[PDB]
Amino acid sequence: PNSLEAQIRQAMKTGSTLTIEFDQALNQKSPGTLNVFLHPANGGVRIDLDSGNQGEPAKILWLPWKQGELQTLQPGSISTVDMLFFTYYLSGSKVFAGDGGPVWHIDAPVEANQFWRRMSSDEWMEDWEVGTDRQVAYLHRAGQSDSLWNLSAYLEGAAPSTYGRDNLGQAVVGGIVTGRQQMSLYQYATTSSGSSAWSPLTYTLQQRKQ
């Protein structure tokens, strides 16, 4: 009926359920705009680089995961409207987003102090003054050693968003571009319970201490 590209946007907007399946090979592709092929999976969508298997061509914003490092999607890559944004599955991983800023994917075991340190060499961060603030979406698995995610030392604002429980659970993070340097981020959790529905990933207001 609707290209899969559209069915997905439908789920994100309304707040239905539609699981996403990623091929591990996507992690070989640097953050940026990427040509991928969507396939109908078992009550969701599969994303890989195979044209066969009733495949539908699409052009997304992609942010992979990389062991022992951060991966960053640059704001200047965010313009084409209704373009879909996806990051690899979150299973310990944190995701931090700036309103018209970059979007970082952090490997699970990276101490907050250490990733904050790396983030701040980025132009958008160097453009974020001690004493002033910005909008920030920030997701982290629930009940994980604070030193791995807690940014209270650097940011003053609403507490972070979370996925899972007792440091158990998977999350998926998607998005839809709504202009230049603007996109509406969504999410869904997978747990022993099963796969939850899509929902907004809000951006609260955070002030910068140091």
Place this chain on the structure above:
Amino acid sequence: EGVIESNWNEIVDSFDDMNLSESLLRGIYAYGFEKPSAIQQRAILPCIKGYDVIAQAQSGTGKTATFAISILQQIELDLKATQALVLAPTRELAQQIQKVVMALGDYMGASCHACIGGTNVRAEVQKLQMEAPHIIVGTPGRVFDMLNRRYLSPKYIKMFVLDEADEMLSRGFKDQIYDIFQKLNSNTQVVLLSATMPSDVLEVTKKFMRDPIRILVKKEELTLEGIRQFYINVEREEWKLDTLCDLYETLTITQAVIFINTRRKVDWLTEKMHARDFTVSAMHGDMDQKERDVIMREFRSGSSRVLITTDLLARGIDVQQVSLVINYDLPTNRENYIHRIGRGGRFGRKGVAINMVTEEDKRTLRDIETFYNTSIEEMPLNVAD
């Protein structure tokens, strides 16, 4: 430190045997250089001659001096136009490059500007409209901006340097880099320096270069730095299962991974741990790609607090975080050991691995530390997650 591996056998161990202009030599000696590094002895020459180069080099003043010297030697000084474009992944690095470039080119009359922006995106534009610097160094976003807005010109650019490419592609500049290259002339010399050499960096060299010169430093890309490795004397095989269950009573374990040498034992152990009331997911080599996709999602979600699997070697396990990892079956060699418990990347250097050692095991490998070439303490009677 790995071992140097070129496809260019020429080596020059003096700056005087490189046919550099006198003024450039003055700058090089005045800056304190006396004899070139391993990477300079191999890379500077193929650059001055104009060939595309790939150099696997750690960050430092010596690495920067490789492409700085090369660039300065090619500049046509009387041509008051930008002739070289260097991309770095941050404002900070870019500015350090400018410093180095200016110092060496000090006696030559070579101009070099840094596309930073900062608190001057309107001010610095007033200087670029006045003069086209010989060499421009900046970040990909900022450079691409200046090209689109016509404050920089690609017309006389014959030398294009990607510094810390692995970084830049981690920081999302792949698009901006691809876009900048599409604006440069066809015959443009590409020099690429990167400490790592993953798939997308290789892919870049394949698109931007022709029959390039490779200077690589092959070394293990997985390490045990930060992993706390332990071993338990189990005496005999039969008493492994009882030891494993006693670890669960002693230690706090969110999730765990257990490595096994054969499939027949993965299936044996999977059912025995079912019988002992454990949320377990099993994985082996005989499975398809779509099957393993399923048993991995179970584990990544929490449906299984335990993944028991076999050494894959070709396929890396899709595991992000785990309380610990258990060698229920000792790997047969250092490479397999490092695949199972070694981590990649510079950060999050932390883990726990426990190795089970039968008496037969000791006979076949005298000393575990020696056999795998790493520290492995006997497990204490304390608690380490």
